[PDB]
């Protein structure tokens, strides 16, 4: 088989979207509150997540059909999926040699111990690192990495979503281009689609654990005051 | 005349309170989002104001009788007076030679042009610098500088204040210790009390202009997102 012109255009739009929103130089990281190694890493990691939310929003706006959804559906999709998209895009800086997210220099190299200094426990950090290792070992083509982030974002099974039918038709079409892409373009990829779909289920589990950890810090005003207004909006519980 | 033991104890408590909350080394400034010289200075100056609000709160908690007020009256007093106390305590770093706030190194030296890079116009910055120059020329003893900040904070004529009678009795007693202090301890200070009281009226005018400027940036979400949660609470319009 061969993939069509429509499926090819979807791929081009999604990889362009990612290149426009993921900065491989990590040059804006110098603008965050500096890393410090009680909760010494929270200011820096809150600025990092806030910055990453902005990029996820930018990325989502460029996904074919996302802008056509109501502002309420776009908001419901981003509030539920943002942390899962952050965990996926972070895989690009994750290093198997160091078991850490390496964003250029040693100042922006984050290990398990650095993340516990932002208030997280091993209940989240152990499955998070296991997920990063597992994802990295899949050796995803950039086309597959960007489709997985778009599939994750366009999931209709999220709280507060109204146009379920439309969102499912968008996700289904993306899943079709991914399966076709793996089959035609990825040599030895016969079990890959099933593996990527399983990573989406691992992400639901990570999102749950993350929501518990976020509730723990957001309920302590001395810690929630270190977050940014965008993190408070997106990880918050308000309903539109 | 001579000042009493009660008035002496008030003075000691207020100067101790200031030394505990004003860091002459400016060593925490390295932890803010770095200064950058659209609205390039906003991240740094929002972190500076957020930090300064925390210090004003700490200072207020140590003013004799402030802790005895209801949480609602403490909140009403801080929301109205915070920016005026920030403008007063900032006088300690203000330099007449540079017409700028000098907080150690050149990175933490703020001139009129740096502040316009946080979204402020000359409508506020011209009277603000004129006030800083005027205050600095008064050559206030540290005892007088700390009494003026406490008098400013304990002003009963603020929106949302309930126990007006109690707050006025606290401010009156502070005004009495200031007049007595100037008369007995400040040589050639016969016109000083009247000058310091006028600075309080200049501060009401600056607070007005500041509220307009803050409304202008807080109404633009791309700019309000650069503020911290504590700045949004304290400069916000919510009523308790």
């Amino acid at each position: 088989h061969m993939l069509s012109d429509e499926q090819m255009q979807i791929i081009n739009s999604l990889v362009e979207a990612h290149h426009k929103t993921y900065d491989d130089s990590y040059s804006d990281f110098v603008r965050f509150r500096p890393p410090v190694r009680r909760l010494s890493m929270l200011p820096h990691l809150a600025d990092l997540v806030s910055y990453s939310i902005q990029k996820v929003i930018g990325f989502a706006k460029m996904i074919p059909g996302f802008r056509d959804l109501t502002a309420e559906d776009q908001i419901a999709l981003l509030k539920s999926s943002a942390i899962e998209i952050i965990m996926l895009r972070s895989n690009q800086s994750f290093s198997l040699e160091d078991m850490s997210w390496s964003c250029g220099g040693p100042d922006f190299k984050y290990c398990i111990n650095d993340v516990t200094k932002a208030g997280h426990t091993l209940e989240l950090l152990e499955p998070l690192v296991k997920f990063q290792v597992g994802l990295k070992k899949l050796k995803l083509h950039e086309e597959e990495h960007v489709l997985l982030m778009a599939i994750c974002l366009l999931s209709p099974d999220r709280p507060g979503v109204q146009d379920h039918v439309r969102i499912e038709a968008l996700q289904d079409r993306l899943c079709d281009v991914l399966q076709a892409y793996i089959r035609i373009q990825h040599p030895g990829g016969r079990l890959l689609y099933a593996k990527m779909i399983q990573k989406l289920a691992d992400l639901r589990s990570l999102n749950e654990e993350h929501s518990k950890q976020y509730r723990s810090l957001s309920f302590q005003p001395e810690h929630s005051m270190q977050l940014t207004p965008l993190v408070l909006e997106v990880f918050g519980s308000e309903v539109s | 005349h001579m000042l009493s033991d009660e008035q002496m104890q008030i003075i000691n408590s207020l100067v101790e309170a200031h030394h505990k909350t004003y860091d002459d080394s400016y060593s925490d400034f390295v932890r803010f989002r770095p200064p950058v010289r659209r609205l390039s200075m906003l991240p740094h100056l929002a972190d500076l104001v957020s930090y300064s609000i925390q210090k004003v709160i700490g200072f207020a908690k140590m003013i004799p009788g402030f802790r005895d007020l209801t949480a609602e009256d403490q909140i009403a007093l801080l929301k109205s007076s915070a920016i005026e106390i920030i403008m007063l305590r900032s006088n300690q770093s203000f330099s007449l030679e540079d017409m700028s706030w000098s907080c150690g190194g050149p990175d933490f030296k703020y001139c009129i042009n740096d502040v316009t890079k946080a979204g402020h116009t000359l409508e506020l910055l011209e009277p603000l610098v004129k006030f800083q120059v005027g205050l600095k020329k008064l050559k206030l003893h540290e005892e007088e500088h700390v009494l003026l900040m406490a008098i400013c904070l304990l002003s009963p004529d603020r929106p949302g204040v309930q126990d007006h009678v109690r707050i006025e009795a606290l401010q009156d007693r502070l005004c009495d210790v200031l007049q007595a202090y100037i008369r007995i301890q400040h040589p050639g200070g016969r016109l000083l009390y009247a000058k310091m009281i006028q600075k309080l009226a200049d501060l009401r005018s600056l607070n007005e202009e500041h509220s307009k400027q803050y409304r202008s940036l807080s109404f633009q979400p791309e700019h309000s997102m650069q503020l911290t949660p504590l700045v949004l609470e304290v400069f916000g319009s919510e009523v308790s």
Binding site: Q54, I57, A71, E233, V234, E238, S240 | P221, E222, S224
Partner: peptide, 11 residues
């Protein structure tokens, strides 16, 4: 509600 989110989602 979602003041920042609405603005970042515009155009």
């Amino acid at each position: 509600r979602h003041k920042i989110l609405h603005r970042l989602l515009q155009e």
